[PDB]
Amino acid sequence: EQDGIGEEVLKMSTEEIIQRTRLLDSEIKIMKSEVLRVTHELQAMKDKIKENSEKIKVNKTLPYLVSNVIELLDVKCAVIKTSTRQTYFLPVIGLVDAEKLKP
């Protein structure tokens, strides 16, 4: 805070009307610009994650087949035998994490 007082000592008509506008006027115009850009993009993307979550809700629907994961691969990949005694493959697993799964 020494330079805060000390720059008010040296140049009394050179930056007291000037520096205390220029980096504050350019601050507040960019702050006025970027307080509304992010806020509008916040509210828009809450709506899109709402609509996607409603979309996943409809296509994630009972009844379910049960099965048992036999093994797990990555080239994330799983080989699944159903309790219909049928072995399927899927390259993409779905609404879990692969690391959270176990055979």
Binding site: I18, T21, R22, D25, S26, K29
Partner: protein
């Protein structure tokens, strides 16, 4: 602040009509006719000693500014920093005025050209190439200003006084004078621009002469009276002859930078006469004899093989060489302008080609009409 110009009213002639008009404009807080008025003062050719007397007022402009286009604001401070005439504090003053608008208006790119405009005179290598390079890193997404490339050439024009900037200057001298359009300044600077343009393609490596510049008006309309030897030696290149008289008379005319590269002159024309003697006969007998090269290029017999392997190496021809007959076969792929009177002969080739297609199509259709169906 109004009295600041009431006491600094002098050196602008017609003092009431421009200074009392001035204190109308910023006291109504307008900033465009004000900007046109201050642009009118600085564009005025005077000594303009009051740059320090106006930069306090220009700081007074930037006090209650809050609106003003930094494009024209930096366009007028580059004349002010031209008037300062002391490059040591001028760079520090420029970078302060550069950083005061880091906003979305790209005048920072022409600040960097204004850096090298004062730095290709002092400190000429270490960051001049960097302020060369940084501009086309940012010269992107927008050809609409075109003063961005205009001033980017202006540092490259000062970069012409380096060693290896002859063809790269020549490529950029077309880029500038293509992107700027109007003539907007007299012959007495433009004809020297054409003069250094003709020498830059003369010394340039990949260029042969790159014709239609002979068609391009900024040399033929501007040097049709003086330096006609350069238009003459561009005639001899685009007409490909040795023509030893006038292609020596350019060395009689041009004393610097031409005798030092006279070997490269004779090197270029002896591989430029090739792509016209193969242009003469239209591949009916393109098997050219070696003596015709030794006659036209007036080179000896033993050098024509290194001469044609050179033009094959550069890639302006894709022929081959036999030596049991010492004749040169020619399959040629480097085309150029063909001078509208020879579009006429090109039309007649196309019509003979046209009627041979149509006639013996009708012979086939009439012959096999019964089984075509």
């Amino acid at each position: 602040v109004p009295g600041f110009l009431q006491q600094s009213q002098n050196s602008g002639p017609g003092q009431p009509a421009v200074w009392h008009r001035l204190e109308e404009l910023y006291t109504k807080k307008l900033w465009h006719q004000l900007t046109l008025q201050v642009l009118d003062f600085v564009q005025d050719p005077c000594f303009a000693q009051g740059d320090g007397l106006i930069k306090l007022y220009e700081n007074f402009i930037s006090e209650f500014e809050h609106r003003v286009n930094p494009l024209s604001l930096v366009e007028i401070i580059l004349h002010v920093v031209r008037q300062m005439t002391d490059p040591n504090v001028a760079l520090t003053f420029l970078e302060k005025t550069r950083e005061k608008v880091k906003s979305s208006d790209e005048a920072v790119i022409l600040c960097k050209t204004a850096i090298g405009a004062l730095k290709l005179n002092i400190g000429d290598l270490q960051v001049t190439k960097e302020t060369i390079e940084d501009v086309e890193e940012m010269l992107n997404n927008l050809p609409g200003v075109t003063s961005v490339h205009s001033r980017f050439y202006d540092l490259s024009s000062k970069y012409y006084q380096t060693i290896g900037n002859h063809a790269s200057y020549y490529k950029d001298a077309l880029r500038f004078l293509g992107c700027v359009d109007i003539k907007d300044l007299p012959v007495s600077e433009q004809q020297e621009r054409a003069f250094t343009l003709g020498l830059a393609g003369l010394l340039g490596e990949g260029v042969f002469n790159f014709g239609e510049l002979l068609m391009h008006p900024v040399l033929e309309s501007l040097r049709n009276t003086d330096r006609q030897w350069l238009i003459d030696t561009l005639y001899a290149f685009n007409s490909g002859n040795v023509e030893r008289f006038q292609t020596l008379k350019t060395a009689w005319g041009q004393q610097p930078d031409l005798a030092a590269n006279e070997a490269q002159l004779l090197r270029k024309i002896q591989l430029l006469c090739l792509m016209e003697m193969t242009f003469t006969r239209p591949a009916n007998h393109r098997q050219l004899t070696f003596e015709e090269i030794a006659k036209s290029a007036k080179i000896t017999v033993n050098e024509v093989e290194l001469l044609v392997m050179k033009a094959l190496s550069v890639g302006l021809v894709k022929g081959s060489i036999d030596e049991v007959d010492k004749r040169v076969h020619m399959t040629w792929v480097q085309p150029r302008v063909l001078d509208l009177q020879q579009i006429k002969g090109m039309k007649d080739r196309l019509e003979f080609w046209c009627t041979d297609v149509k006639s013996m199509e009708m012979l086939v259709e009439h012959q096999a009409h019964d089984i075509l169906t």
